[PDB]
């Protein structure tokens, strides 16, 4: 009934610290050995570290060493990642995995996201984008993520909500679009509903 749940991520400043956790249920945590793997945005898999049995043995990937420490409380069933000296590039979903009985990653968790920025928490501005296309421009926000809706969720159809760009700034920008009958349009009202929770920011934008 094998479960793994990671916790602990965060926005974090370059130079600093962050601890991650991995709660195991379902198996002999204590018989296994464990890894951490990491997944930058737009990007592939990257093995980070391994811990034994026993705690005795700990391997680290090169890009991490001296910064990161791997550890383990056996007896609250839990795996740990200590991340010192954080840089920009350490931004990644962090997965914990079970070693088999190896070098084999049997069970993974769902991951936890680590964002490494000197940038300041912010809400977006919400600009209008006026066979027809329309949408909203979601500028200059930090951090991820953000939600878009059209007409309170009643518009679904012909919707494209595009992935965010990072910003030189270190702010996010984005777009949601919709296509519609040019017909409609006189006459049908369009409102993009923007939620940016880590700022407690909600915007409703009529586009016309």
């Amino acid at each position: 009934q094998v479960q793994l749940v990671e916790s602990g991520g965060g926005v974090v400043q370059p130079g600093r610290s962050l601890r991650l956790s991995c709660a195991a249920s379902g198996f002999t945590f204590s018989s296994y050995g464990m890894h951490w793997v990491r997944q930058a945005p737009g990007k592939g898999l990257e093995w980070v570290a391994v811990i034994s049995y026993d705690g005795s043995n700990k391997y680290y990937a090169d890009s991490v060493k001296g910064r990161f420490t791997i550890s383990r409380d056996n007896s609250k069933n839990t795996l740990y990642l200590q991340m010192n000296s954080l840089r920009a590039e350490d931004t990644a979903v962090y997965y914990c995995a079970k070693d088999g009985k190896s070098g084999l990653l049997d069970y993974w968790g769902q991951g936890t996201l680590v964002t490494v920025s000197s940038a300041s928490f912010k809400g977006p501005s919400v600009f209008p984008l006026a066979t027809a296309a329309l949408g909203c421009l979601v500028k200059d926000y930090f951090p991820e993520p953000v939600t878009v809706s059209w007409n309170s969720g009643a518009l679904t159809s012909g919707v494209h909500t595009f992935p965010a760009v990072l910003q030189s700034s270190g702010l996010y920008s984005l777009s949601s679009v919709v296509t519609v009958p040019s017909s409609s349009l006189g006459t049908q009202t369009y409102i993009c509903n923007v939620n940016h929770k880590p700022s407690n920011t909600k915007v409703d934008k009529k586009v016309e």
Binding site: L45, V50, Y59, P128, A133, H160, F162, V165, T179
Partner: protein
């Protein structure tokens, strides 16, 4: 350090087709080769362990072969389920443990032309001393396209950002947004504003444009 190579990057296939996936080692990794499935915004899952073995809960459509430097991933008939990202990984020589870069499995479809839209900067942005120029690429196939920015016929590099959608679950389409970033001041100085779209299914390339 073993280098793992995945070929191709992208596999473009229909459902019901046989799927065949490749992984090359840089030296022999013997029989120590794994395969991993990652569906979108989920984590990795184990398919094949040690070339040839099915993982629990893993259906029989899934198969592998090889030895040494040479590896294969076999799917027999594609479920739509299966249009995903697939990674290989060695446990022969570590640390480091290494991964393949991924193959992605795309839905193959008929070639679709973009759908082209230009957006001038808003009114309201104009004040923040903002200006974004927006160009839309609608529902197109395959994924490769090319945007060109132009301002009073000067073409723009380094000033731009672009995004792409996931594959359309009904359409099997891709969409793209391009953002042109720009001073208010610059904005004002200039007249002609232009998005140039180059794609496989256009005879010629398309240009959407506006006068400020």
């Amino acid at each position: 350090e073993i280098v793992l190579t995945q070929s191709p990057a992208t596999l473009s296939l229909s459902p019901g087709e046989r799927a065949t996936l490749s992984c090359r080692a840089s030296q022999s990794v013997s029989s120590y080769l794994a395969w991993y499935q990652q569906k979108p915004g989920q984590a990795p899952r184990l398919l094949i362990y040690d070339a040839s073995n099915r993982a629990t809960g893993i259906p029989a459509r899934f198969s592998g072969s090889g030895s040494g430097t040479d590896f294969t991933l076999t799917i027999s008939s594609l479920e739509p389920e299966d249009f995903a990202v697939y990674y290989c990984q060695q446990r022969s020589n570590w640390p480091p443990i290494t991964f393949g870069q991924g193959t992605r499995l795309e839905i193959k479809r008929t070639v679709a032309a973009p759908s082209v839209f230009i957006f001038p900067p808003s009114d309201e942005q104009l004040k923040s001393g903002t200006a974004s120029v927006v160009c839309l690429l609608n529902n197109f196939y395959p994924r490769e396209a090319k945007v060109q920015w132009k301002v009073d016929n000067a073409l723009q590099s380094g000033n731009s950002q672009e995004s792409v959608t996931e594959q359309d679950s009904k359409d099997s389409t891709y969409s793209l947004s391009s953002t042109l970033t720009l001073s208010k001041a610059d904005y004002e100085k200039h007249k002609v504003y232009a998005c140039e779209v180059t794609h496989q299914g256009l005879s010629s390339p398309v240009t959407k444009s506006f006068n400020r």
